[PDB]
Amino acid sequence: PVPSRARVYTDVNTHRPSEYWDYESHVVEWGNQDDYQLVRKLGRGKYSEVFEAINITNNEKVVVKILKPVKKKKIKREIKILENLRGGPNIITLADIVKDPVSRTPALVFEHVNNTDFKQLYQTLTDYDIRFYMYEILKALDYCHSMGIMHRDVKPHNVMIDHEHRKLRLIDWGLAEFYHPGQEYNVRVASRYFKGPELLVDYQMYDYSLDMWSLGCMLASMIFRKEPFFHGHDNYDQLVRIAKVLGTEDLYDYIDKYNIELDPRFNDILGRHSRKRWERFVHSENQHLVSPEALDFLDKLLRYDHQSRLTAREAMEHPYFYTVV
Ligand SMILES: O=C(CC(=O)Nc1cccc(C(=O)O)c1)NCCCNCc1ccc(-c2ccccc2)c(Cl)c1
């Protein structure tokens, strides 16, 4: 395959010292978990369980993330990235790192965010609210990309919104990685519905632009009220669902530009599909969230070619955000 690199923040890690990106050599100093009392379970994941908690020394609510120590290298990676991004706009704030004295199970302590139930919010969301929150996510992505970090797991589940205080946080940096130009990454990242075509065609030399495809998937589900937008049943079928919208002509243009070898598993399922107009997804239930600006913005995110998608900074300058601060 033809090599590729990010259009932006290409050399940010190259120009920094080893301490910033060499997470395996990072010294993790675990405090005492006795300062925290667990309140309730907030969620369960493959390698973590998240709890609402109280810091007993200041009577302040926190969030405690207990990690199943399946791979130390992955825990070190998450800790280093959270330490590097600490205090960035709309990035979840790591406040402490603890180990329970008896269990010795690694746990991350974060700032508390009061998540509004999405199912309830989803119905009351306006065109303005979508633009406002999209912009908040973009601030988080432009910042972490500027810091040489790819989140690689952008999805509704990893976005927290406190609608009452119009606060948003991008969470779960467990799959995030440092971007190094020319590096070949593991394509087994992100959640099925949000995986970019680069991952599905096994093109390993991807970059920050993967996050912009995932964001495009979220934008499409939100404005069209179709969750998920690309409803694959497996990773191969996921590409077929994308091809039913973007068409197969542009897919062959993409794999040809990077000299990608399409897996034979695609041979009998891909078929032939025309390029669909974004206006075909407009219906009575969602027309109040759709506008020519939104469709033009969506069209600039949902492109096979990772290099031709808008960067987070270019996305922030799009006319769709001319109504937000
Ligand atoms: O995962 C959790 C629990 C939790 O608090 N987890 C957590 C907390 C703190 C840190 C961590 C961590 O893993 O680092 C995890 N909550 C799920 C929140 C789901 N958010 C729903 C949602 C929010 C915003 C959007 C959205 C809004 C406007 C435009 C586009 C998208 C959507 Cl689609 C969905």
Q: What is the CATH number of the domain that holds 161?
A: 1.10.510.10
User: In terms of C-beta density within 10 A (0-12 exposed, 13-18 middle, 19 or more buried), how is residue 142 classed?
Assistant: buried
By DSSP bridging, strand 94-99 and strand 31-32 are parallel
User: Is 104 in the same domain as 128?
Assistant: no
| Residue 74 CA, ligand 1 centroid: distance in Å | 21
User: Is 201 in the same domain as 76?
Assistant: no
- Where residue 92 sits, what CATH number does that domain have? 3.30.200.20
User: Is 122 in the same domain as 64?
Assistant: no
User: Is 104 in the same domain as 183?
Assistant: no
Is position 153 annotated as part of the catalytic site? yes
User: Is 51 in the same domain as 173?
Assistant: no
Nearest CA to ligand 1 atom 14: 172
Tell me how far apart the alpha carbons of residues 322 and 318 are, in angstroms, rounded to a whole number.
7
User: Is 306 in the same domain as 252?
Assistant: yes
User: Is 103 in the same domain as 222?
Assistant: no
User: Is 163 in the same domain as 106?
Assistant: no
Nearest CA to ligand 1 atom 17: 157
Which of 112, 147, 172 is the last residue in one of the domains?
Answer: 112
Give me the number of domains the chain comprises.
2
Q: How would you classify residue 181: left for phi > 0, otherwise alpha for psi between -120 and 50, otherwise beta? A: beta
**Annotated catalytic residue within 153, 172, 207, 211:** 153
139, 47 Cβ separation under 8 angstroms: no
User: Is 250 in the same domain as 210?
Assistant: yes
Q: How would you classify residue 304: left for phi > 0, otherwise alpha for psi between -120 and 50, otherwise beta? A: alpha
User: Is 100 in the same domain as 231?
Assistant: no
Which of 112, 146, 161 is the last residue in one of the domains?
Answer: 112
Nearest CA to ligand 1 atom 1: 157
User: Is 291 in the same domain as 201?
Assistant: yes
User: Is 77 in the same domain as 145?
Assistant: no
| Residue 155 CA, ligand 1 centroid: distance in Å | 8
Q: Which domain holds residue 292?
A: 4-21+113-325
Residues with CB under 6 A from ligand 1: 42-43, 50, 63, 65, 92, 110, 115, 118, 130, 133-134, 156-157, 159-161, 171-172, 218, 222
Which position has the token pair 């219906």? 283
Which of 58, 83, 112 is the last residue in one of the domains?
Answer: 112
Q: Resolution for this model in angstroms, one decimal place? A: 1.8
